């Protein structure tokens, strides 16, 4: 009894179906393609290939329309599940299909086909966040707020420029995904268990049937290679780092202390104890989820580190992490878009905090330096003027001319336009600077580029 | 549990993203048991009458027995989490009374308690699994005291050892895992319940009495810390990570001993796969999976560290990410401890091959240096001398013992016919007579000591 329990434990420990069912569709189209290779190589007649294709097409439509059926079976993995469902439709012809093929090059192929499908969905979700960000930017070009270094008020910025910062981060995530795609777009099918098919299959022809751009150059490498999962996990970890920063900023902007931003009821939840709470749960989950992506990355690295060639059962650990991390990344991309959709920027509070920063003390200092006051003395004087202004509870620009002239006689009426928030924005007029004219052009450039 | 502050419902995609039920239902028993203890705190302080508490306990116990019978039923609900699920089922059963149970409590409070209760049970199981492995290793050692084999450093033939000694090496690793689990359990055996959402319950509850009801050793000293603390998850993950490193080395060793090249070990069919064509080759499936599974435990560790890093006080929603990581990592560690034990029974050590290999690679060269020392030759000099003898032995393709005396005396004139008994396999073992050494008497003393420590 406890022997049987132990054997059943071993079967659960060993089996992969419960996560690799996720590869059903890829295993099936992969099988279609192999079947054609076998014809070129004289194992299958053209008729057996058509019957096999027919049964695989029916199975594909059935898995699409009801994926939950796979997990009803006690098959050990999908390859064996698909094989079993093939034999029901076609008899021993569904075993003959595995001729010249191994589970090692089979799963390598399925996995890369899955990555292609998934990178595609990630590219879309990523482009959608960019577009959500750019749209948010368009509607908040007038939202002047404090920029931050060290979480201290620095030169003022606009909410729009803040959005386009994340657009840029996301644009690099997009090219990272594109590059990973091109690099993984190589068919490992026809590589046998480790040393190649024992048939004269045309692997480049086979790759074409699979939709891959070329075939792998080395069978040992083909069966042992999981770079694409490491690289996709890297891309995801960096993407999630981006989203964790976005979340951190929005959560600060969302504090009662800041009051910069109000989030929608759709994307927010309450407290079981505290009747007033409206918490940024979605933003917090997005940053909390950075860790599981990172863990998936670390785990895959550790799994592959020190692993001898060619194939090893350790490599069955390549899927759960990848699946979880890419699902997470996709969910976070969607959720970040959703948060933006309902966001309200509280413009007066943003501007009030911008003005309580005294960044224009700089502009005062070199107004004075431009008027001839020595550097050291200029800074001393503005320092004094700033202390007095906070004592009176007003911005520098709010001091009457008679008051400012007590700090330096050279200050005149022309000081006031030079101290304005608008003036300080308009000076940053180089590419990527925060002047409204530049931000406006960046939004337009991103609209055109994003479609 | 909330909604009065809200004018609009959650978006469907937010609900799927935010809900914890699909995994926190694992805490059902703990949640209900904590709720019972909380109902008692509430009497103490006038929120509930004695008969109201008795009535809540009845309904909670019904839920407990229902949930024990088929936990899966929980997942039929669209409840946000296990806490809302319990409260909702209480209300169905007792009406308005069910709306009273959450007085003075928060989910921050509740989940912190539920998770520590679950850790206690899980650590216990890990401890049990760790001890069976130790004791399975000890028994394998018992039965393989005579299996001289090569010892390795750098995967190079070092000095002879025995398979018993190898086994006991892993016993020592596991015993430190065991003590790490015990120390972690002590630190975590502290009740956070009664700390509200961060600042305390607004009630004169006796939190040490509450701890007693829950089976904890004491109550936490600071509400802010209590609702925000996940040290115990990091500490358990880190113990699991170390434990999994040990298992990965165990895996690496056996997979190596199982090669056609070594041939030291035959494993059971129960734990391997292979082909009827080549019944000699067994793929070490369980072992490969044990070492492969090290990563996900390492990943859970890194992941929880990252999620906790830079988080302000007190509770934050990020902390909902603790459970999935911990569940996976401790389940993995438990399964690997069980499979390691499964691999050990029916394992067979192939003695003739082990012994043959133990006599190769000039693994007796230390004995010659030591022999030179005993004749007065400074160890460093002896070492150099023997190294050169090895270079000549390699050149002749002979073991040191097969070098004629006249040849050996070219290296040192002090060498006489008594080197030869010193080069034997049995003498390599006998000479290592200090504690933790490989002599037959030391290994026997170590086996007997491990048997006593574990019995």
Coordinates of N, CA, C and O in Angstrom, one line a residue, chain A residues 48-185:
Chain A
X48 N -1.1 8.0 -46.3 CA -1.0 8.0 -44.8 C -0.8 9.4 -44.2 O -1.3 9.7 -43.2
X49 N 0.0 10.2 -45.0 CA 0.3 11.6 -44.6 C -1.0 12.4 -44.6 O -1.1 13.3 -43.7
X50 N -1.9 12.2 -45.5 CA -3.2 12.9 -45.6 C -4.1 12.5 -44.5 O -4.8 13.3 -43.9
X51 N -4.2 11.2 -44.2 CA -5.0 10.7 -43.1 C -4.5 11.2 -41.7 O -5.4 11.7 -41.0
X52 N -3.2 11.2 -41.5 CA -2.6 11.7 -40.3 C -2.9 13.2 -40.2 O -3.3 13.7 -39.1
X53 N -2.7 14.0 -41.3 CA -3.1 15.4 -41.3 C -4.5 15.6 -41.0 O -4.9 16.5 -40.1
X54 N -5.4 14.8 -41.6 CA -6.9 14.9 -41.3 C -7.2 14.7 -39.9 O -7.9 15.6 -39.3
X55 N -6.7 13.7 -39.2 CA -6.9 13.4 -37.8 C -6.3 14.4 -36.9 O -6.9 14.7 -35.8
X56 N -5.2 15.0 -37.3 CA -4.5 16.0 -36.5 C -5.3 17.3 -36.5 O -5.5 18.0 -35.5
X57 N -5.9 17.6 -37.7 CA -6.7 18.8 -37.9 C -7.9 18.8 -37.0 O -8.3 19.8 -36.4
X58 N -8.6 17.6 -37.0 CA -9.8 17.4 -36.2 C -9.4 17.5 -34.7 O -10.1 18.2 -34.0
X59 N -8.3 16.9 -34.3 CA -7.8 17.0 -32.9 C -7.5 18.4 -32.5 O -7.9 18.9 -31.4
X60 N -6.9 19.2 -33.4 CA -6.6 20.6 -33.1 C -7.8 21.4 -32.9 O -7.9 22.1 -31.8
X61 N -8.8 21.3 -33.8 CA -10.1 22.0 -33.6 C -10.8 21.6 -32.3 O -11.4 22.4 -31.6
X62 N -10.6 20.3 -31.8 CA -11.2 19.8 -30.6 C -10.5 20.3 -29.4 O -11.2 20.7 -28.4
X63 N -9.2 20.4 -29.4 CA -8.4 21.0 -28.3 C -8.6 22.4 -28.2 O -8.8 23.0 -27.1
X64 N -8.7 23.1 -29.3 CA -9.0 24.5 -29.3 C -10.4 24.8 -28.6 O -10.5 25.6 -27.7
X65 N -11.4 24.0 -29.1 CA -12.7 24.2 -28.6 C -13.0 23.6 -27.2 O -14.1 23.8 -26.7
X66 N -12.1 22.8 -26.7 CA -12.2 22.2 -25.3 C -10.9 21.7 -24.8 O -10.7 20.5 -24.8
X67 N -10.1 22.6 -24.3 CA -8.7 22.3 -23.8 C -8.8 21.5 -22.5 O -7.8 20.8 -22.2
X68 N -9.8 21.6 -21.7 CA -9.9 21.0 -20.4 C -10.0 19.5 -20.5 O -9.7 18.8 -19.5
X69 N -10.2 18.9 -21.7 CA -10.3 17.5 -21.9 C -8.9 16.7 -21.7 O -8.9 15.6 -21.3
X70 N -7.8 17.4 -21.9 CA -6.5 16.9 -21.8 C -6.2 16.4 -20.4 O -5.8 15.3 -20.2
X71 N -6.6 17.3 -19.5 CA -6.2 17.1 -18.1 C -7.1 16.0 -17.4 O -6.9 15.7 -16.2
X72 N -8.1 15.6 -18.1 CA -9.0 14.5 -17.7 C -8.3 13.1 -17.9 O -8.6 12.2 -17.2
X73 N -7.3 13.1 -18.8 CA -6.5 11.9 -19.0 C -5.4 11.7 -18.0 O -4.9 12.7 -17.4
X74 N -4.8 10.5 -17.9 CA -3.7 10.3 -17.0 C -2.4 10.1 -17.8 O -1.3 9.7 -17.2
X75 N -2.4 10.4 -19.1 CA -1.2 10.5 -19.9 C -0.1 11.3 -19.2 O -0.3 12.3 -18.5
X76 N 1.2 10.9 -19.5 CA 2.3 11.4 -18.7 C 2.7 12.9 -19.2 O 3.1 13.7 -18.4
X77 N 2.6 13.1 -20.5 CA 2.8 14.4 -21.1 C 1.9 14.6 -22.4 O 1.3 13.7 -22.8
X78 N 1.9 15.8 -23.0 CA 1.0 16.0 -24.2 C 1.5 15.2 -25.4 O 0.6 14.8 -26.2
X79 N 2.8 15.0 -25.5 CA 3.3 14.2 -26.7 C 2.6 12.9 -26.7 O 2.1 12.4 -27.8
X80 N 2.6 12.3 -25.6 CA 2.0 10.9 -25.4 C 0.5 11.0 -25.4 O -0.2 10.2 -26.0
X81 N -0.1 12.1 -24.8 CA -1.5 12.4 -25.0 C -1.9 12.5 -26.4 O -2.9 11.8 -26.8
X82 N -1.2 13.3 -27.2 CA -1.5 13.5 -28.6 C -1.4 12.2 -29.4 O -2.2 11.8 -30.2
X83 N -0.3 11.4 -29.2 CA -0.1 10.1 -29.7 C -1.2 9.2 -29.5 O -1.7 8.5 -30.4
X84 N -1.7 9.1 -28.2 CA -2.8 8.3 -27.9 C -4.1 8.7 -28.6 O -4.9 7.8 -29.0
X85 N -4.3 10.0 -28.8 CA -5.5 10.5 -29.4 C -5.5 10.2 -30.9 O -6.5 10.0 -31.6
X86 N -4.2 10.2 -31.5 CA -4.0 9.9 -32.9 C -4.3 8.4 -33.1 O -4.9 8.1 -34.2
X87 N -3.9 7.5 -32.2 CA -4.0 6.1 -32.4 C -5.5 5.7 -32.4 O -5.9 4.8 -33.1
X88 N -6.3 6.4 -31.6 CA -7.8 6.2 -31.6 C -8.4 6.5 -32.9 O -9.3 5.8 -33.4
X89 N -7.9 7.6 -33.6 CA -8.4 8.0 -34.9 C -7.9 7.1 -36.0 O -8.6 6.9 -37.0
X90 N -6.6 6.7 -35.9 CA -5.9 6.2 -37.1 C -5.2 4.8 -36.9 O -4.8 4.2 -37.8
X91 N -5.2 4.3 -35.6 CA -4.5 3.1 -35.3 C -3.0 3.2 -35.3 O -2.5 4.3 -34.9
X92 N -2.3 2.2 -35.6 CA -0.8 2.2 -35.4 C -0.1 3.2 -36.3 O 1.1 3.5 -36.0
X93 N -0.8 3.8 -37.3 CA -0.2 4.9 -38.0 C 0.2 6.1 -37.2 O 1.1 6.9 -37.5
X94 N -0.4 6.3 -36.0 CA -0.1 7.4 -35.1 C 1.1 7.1 -34.3 O 1.7 8.1 -33.7
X95 N 1.6 5.9 -34.2 CA 2.9 5.5 -33.7 C 3.9 5.7 -34.7 O 5.0 6.3 -34.5
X96 N 3.6 5.2 -35.9 CA 4.6 5.3 -37.1 C 5.0 6.8 -37.3 O 6.1 7.0 -37.9
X97 N 4.2 7.7 -37.0 CA 4.5 9.1 -37.1 C 5.7 9.5 -36.3 O 6.5 10.4 -36.8
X98 N 6.0 8.9 -35.2 CA 7.2 9.2 -34.3 C 8.5 8.6 -34.9 O 9.6 9.0 -34.4
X99 N 8.4 7.9 -36.0 CA 9.6 7.4 -36.7 C 10.6 8.5 -37.1 O 10.2 9.6 -37.6
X100 N 11.8 8.3 -36.7 CA 12.9 9.3 -36.9 C 12.9 10.5 -36.0 O 13.6 11.4 -36.2
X101 N 11.9 10.5 -35.1 CA 11.7 11.7 -34.2 C 11.9 11.3 -32.8 O 11.7 10.1 -32.4
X102 N 12.4 12.2 -31.9 CA 12.5 11.9 -30.5 C 11.6 12.9 -29.7 O 11.2 13.9 -30.2
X103 N 11.3 12.5 -28.4 CA 10.7 13.6 -27.6 C 11.6 14.7 -27.4 O 11.1 15.8 -27.1
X104 N 12.9 14.5 -27.4 CA 13.9 15.6 -27.2 C 13.8 16.7 -28.3 O 13.6 17.8 -27.9
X105 N 13.9 16.3 -29.5 CA 13.7 17.3 -30.6 C 12.2 17.8 -30.7 O 12.0 18.9 -31.1
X106 N 11.3 16.9 -30.4 CA 9.9 17.2 -30.4 C 9.5 18.3 -29.4 O 8.9 19.3 -29.8
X107 N 9.9 18.2 -28.2 CA 9.6 19.2 -27.2 C 10.3 20.5 -27.4 O 9.8 21.6 -27.2
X108 N 11.5 20.4 -27.9 CA 12.3 21.6 -28.2 C 11.5 22.4 -29.3 O 11.5 23.6 -29.2
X109 N 10.9 21.7 -30.2 CA 10.2 22.3 -31.3 C 8.9 22.9 -30.8 O 8.6 24.1 -31.2
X110 N 8.1 22.2 -30.0 CA 6.9 22.6 -29.5 C 7.1 23.9 -28.7 O 6.4 24.9 -28.9
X111 N 8.1 23.9 -27.8 CA 8.4 25.0 -27.0 C 8.7 26.3 -27.8 O 8.2 27.4 -27.4
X112 N 9.5 26.1 -28.8 CA 9.9 27.3 -29.6 C 8.6 27.8 -30.4 O 8.5 29.0 -30.6
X113 N 7.8 26.9 -30.9 CA 6.5 27.3 -31.5 C 5.7 28.1 -30.5 O 5.1 29.1 -30.9
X114 N 5.6 27.6 -29.3 CA 4.9 28.3 -28.2 C 5.4 29.7 -28.0 O 4.7 30.7 -27.8
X115 N 6.7 29.8 -27.9 CA 7.4 31.1 -27.7 C 7.0 32.1 -28.8 O 6.6 33.2 -28.5
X116 N 7.0 31.6 -30.0 CA 6.6 32.5 -31.1 C 5.1 33.0 -30.9 O 4.9 34.2 -31.1
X117 N 4.2 32.1 -30.6 CA 2.8 32.5 -30.4 C 2.7 33.5 -29.2 O 2.0 34.5 -29.3
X118 N 3.5 33.3 -28.2 CA 3.4 34.1 -27.0 C 4.1 35.5 -27.1 O 3.5 36.5 -26.7
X119 N 5.3 35.5 -27.7 CA 6.0 36.7 -28.0 C 5.0 37.6 -28.8 O 4.8 38.8 -28.5
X120 N 4.3 37.1 -29.8 CA 3.2 37.8 -30.5 C 2.2 38.4 -29.6 O 1.9 39.6 -29.8
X121 N 1.6 37.7 -28.7 CA 0.7 38.3 -27.7 C 1.3 39.3 -26.8 O 0.7 40.3 -26.4
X122 N 2.6 39.2 -26.5 CA 3.3 40.1 -25.6 C 3.6 41.4 -26.4 O 3.5 42.5 -25.8
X123 N 3.9 41.3 -27.7 CA 4.2 42.4 -28.5 C 2.9 43.3 -28.6 O 3.0 44.5 -28.3
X124 N 1.8 42.7 -28.8 CA 0.5 43.4 -28.8 C 0.2 44.1 -27.5 O -0.2 45.3 -27.5
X125 N 0.3 43.4 -26.4 CA -0.1 43.9 -25.1 C 0.9 45.1 -24.7 O 0.4 46.1 -24.2
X126 N 2.1 44.9 -25.1 CA 3.1 46.0 -24.9 C 2.9 47.2 -25.7 O 3.0 48.3 -25.2
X127 N 2.4 47.0 -27.0 CA 2.1 48.2 -27.9 C 0.8 48.9 -27.3 O 0.7 50.1 -27.4
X128 N -0.1 48.1 -26.8 CA -1.3 48.7 -26.2 C -1.0 49.5 -24.9 O -1.7 50.6 -24.8
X129 N -0.1 49.1 -24.1 CA 0.3 50.0 -23.0 C 1.0 51.3 -23.5 O 0.7 52.3 -23.0
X130 N 1.9 51.1 -24.4 CA 2.5 52.3 -25.0 C 1.4 53.3 -25.5 O 1.5 54.5 -25.1
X131 N 0.4 52.8 -26.2 CA -0.7 53.6 -26.7 C -1.5 54.2 -25.6 O -2.0 55.3 -25.8
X132 N -1.7 53.4 -24.6 CA -2.5 53.9 -23.4 C -1.7 55.1 -22.8 O -2.3 56.0 -22.3
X133 N -0.4 54.9 -22.8 CA 0.5 55.9 -22.1 C 0.5 57.2 -22.9 O 0.4 58.3 -22.4
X134 N 0.6 57.1 -24.2 CA 0.6 58.2 -25.1 C -0.7 58.9 -25.1 O -0.7 60.2 -25.1
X135 N -1.8 58.2 -25.1 CA -3.1 58.8 -25.0 C -3.2 59.5 -23.6 O -3.8 60.6 -23.6
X136 N -2.7 58.9 -22.6 CA -2.8 59.6 -21.3 C -2.0 60.9 -21.4 O -2.5 62.0 -21.0
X137 N -0.8 60.9 -21.9 CA 0.0 62.0 -22.2 C -0.7 63.2 -22.9 O -0.6 64.3 -22.6
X138 N -1.4 62.8 -24.0 CA -2.1 63.7 -24.9 C -3.1 64.5 -24.0 O -3.4 65.7 -24.3
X139 N -3.7 63.9 -23.1 CA -4.8 64.4 -22.3 C -4.3 65.1 -21.1 O -5.0 65.7 -20.3
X140 N -3.0 65.0 -20.8 CA -2.4 65.7 -19.7 C -1.1 66.5 -20.0 O -0.1 66.5 -19.2
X141 N -1.1 67.3 -21.0 CA 0.0 68.1 -21.4 C 0.1 69.4 -20.6 O 1.2 70.0 -20.5
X142 N -1.0 69.7 -20.0 CA -1.1 70.9 -19.2 C -0.8 70.6 -17.7 O -0.8 71.5 -16.9
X143 N -0.7 69.3 -17.4 CA -0.5 68.9 -16.0 C 0.9 69.1 -15.5 O 1.7 68.1 -15.4
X144 N 1.3 70.3 -15.1 CA 2.6 70.6 -14.6 C 2.7 70.1 -13.2 O 1.7 70.2 -12.4
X145 N 3.8 69.4 -12.9 CA 4.0 68.7 -11.6 C 5.5 68.8 -11.3 O 6.3 69.2 -12.2
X146 N 5.9 68.4 -10.1 CA 7.3 68.4 -9.7 C 7.9 67.2 -10.4 O 7.3 66.2 -10.4
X147 N 9.1 67.4 -10.9 CA 10.0 66.3 -11.2 C 10.7 65.9 -9.9 O 10.8 66.7 -9.0
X148 N 11.2 64.7 -9.9 CA 11.8 64.1 -8.7 C 13.2 63.6 -8.9 O 13.4 62.8 -9.9
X149 N 14.1 64.0 -8.1 CA 15.3 63.2 -7.9 C 15.5 63.0 -6.4 O 15.4 64.0 -5.7
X150 N 15.7 61.8 -6.0 CA 15.8 61.4 -4.6 C 14.5 61.6 -3.9 O 14.5 61.9 -2.7
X151 N 13.4 61.5 -4.6 CA 12.1 61.8 -4.1 C 12.0 63.3 -3.6 O 11.1 63.5 -2.7
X152 N 12.8 64.1 -4.0 CA 12.8 65.5 -3.7 C 12.4 66.4 -4.9 O 12.8 66.0 -6.0
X153 N 11.7 67.4 -4.7 CA 11.2 68.2 -5.8 C 12.3 68.9 -6.6 O 13.1 69.6 -6.0
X154 N 12.4 68.5 -7.9 CA 13.5 69.1 -8.7 C 12.8 69.9 -9.8 O 11.7 70.4 -9.6
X155 N 13.5 70.2 -10.9 CA 12.8 71.0 -12.0 C 11.4 70.4 -12.3 O 11.2 69.2 -12.4
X156 N 10.4 71.3 -12.4 CA 9.1 70.8 -12.8 C 9.0 70.2 -14.2 O 9.8 70.5 -15.1
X157 N 8.0 69.3 -14.3 CA 7.9 68.4 -15.4 C 6.4 68.4 -15.8 O 5.6 69.1 -15.1
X158 N 5.9 67.7 -16.8 CA 4.5 67.5 -16.9 C 4.1 66.1 -16.9 O 5.0 65.2 -17.2
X159 N 2.9 65.8 -16.5 CA 2.5 64.4 -16.4 C 2.7 63.7 -17.7 O 3.0 62.5 -17.7
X160 N 2.6 64.4 -18.8 CA 2.7 63.8 -20.1 C 4.1 63.4 -20.4 O 4.4 62.2 -20.9
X161 N 5.1 64.2 -20.0 CA 6.5 63.8 -20.1 C 6.8 62.6 -19.2 O 7.6 61.7 -19.6
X162 N 6.1 62.5 -18.1 CA 6.3 61.3 -17.2 C 5.8 60.0 -17.9 O 6.4 59.0 -17.9
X163 N 4.6 60.2 -18.6 CA 4.1 59.0 -19.4 C 5.1 58.5 -20.5 O 5.3 57.3 -20.6
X164 N 5.6 59.5 -21.2 CA 6.5 59.2 -22.4 C 7.8 58.6 -21.9 O 8.5 58.0 -22.7
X165 N 8.1 58.7 -20.6 CA 9.3 58.1 -20.1 C 9.1 56.6 -20.1 O 10.0 55.9 -20.5
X166 N 7.9 56.1 -19.7 CA 7.5 54.7 -19.7 C 7.3 54.2 -21.1 O 7.6 53.0 -21.3
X167 N 6.9 55.0 -22.0 CA 6.7 54.7 -23.4 C 8.1 54.2 -24.0 O 8.2 53.2 -24.7
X168 N 9.1 55.0 -23.6 CA 10.5 54.8 -24.1 C 11.0 53.4 -23.5 O 11.6 52.6 -24.2
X169 N 10.9 53.2 -22.2 CA 11.2 52.0 -21.5 C 10.5 50.8 -22.3 O 11.1 49.8 -22.6
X170 N 9.2 51.0 -22.5 CA 8.4 49.9 -23.2 C 8.9 49.7 -24.6 O 8.9 48.5 -25.1
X171 N 9.3 50.7 -25.3 CA 9.8 50.6 -26.7 C 11.1 49.7 -26.8 O 11.3 49.0 -27.8
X172 N 11.9 49.8 -25.7 CA 13.1 48.9 -25.6 C 12.7 47.5 -25.3 O 13.3 46.5 -25.8
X173 N 11.7 47.3 -24.4 CA 11.1 46.0 -24.2 C 10.6 45.4 -25.5 O 10.9 44.2 -25.8
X174 N 10.0 46.2 -26.4 CA 9.5 45.7 -27.6 C 10.7 45.3 -28.6 O 10.6 44.2 -29.1
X175 N 11.7 46.0 -28.7 CA 12.8 45.6 -29.5 C 13.5 44.4 -29.0 O 14.0 43.5 -29.7
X176 N 13.6 44.3 -27.6 CA 14.2 43.1 -27.0 C 13.3 41.8 -27.3 O 13.9 40.8 -27.6
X177 N 12.0 42.0 -27.3 CA 11.1 40.9 -27.7 C 11.3 40.5 -29.2 O 11.4 39.4 -29.6
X178 N 11.4 41.6 -30.1 CA 11.6 41.4 -31.5 C 13.0 40.6 -31.7 O 13.0 39.7 -32.6
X179 N 14.0 41.0 -31.0 CA 15.4 40.4 -31.2 C 15.4 38.9 -30.8 O 15.9 38.1 -31.5
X180 N 14.8 38.7 -29.6 CA 14.6 37.3 -29.1 C 13.9 36.4 -30.1 O 14.3 35.3 -30.3
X181 N 12.8 37.0 -30.6 CA 12.0 36.3 -31.6 C 12.8 35.8 -32.8 O 12.8 34.6 -33.3
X182 N 13.6 36.7 -33.4 CA 14.4 36.5 -34.6 C 15.4 35.4 -34.2 O 15.6 34.4 -35.0
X183 N 16.0 35.4 -33.0 CA 17.0 34.5 -32.6 C 16.5 33.1 -32.3 O 17.2 32.1 -32.5
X184 N 15.3 33.0 -31.9 CA 14.7 31.7 -31.5 C 14.0 31.1 -32.7 O 13.6 29.9 -32.7
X185 N 13.8 31.8 -33.8 CA 13.1 31.4 -35.0 C 13.9 30.4 -35.8 O 14.1 30.6 -37.0

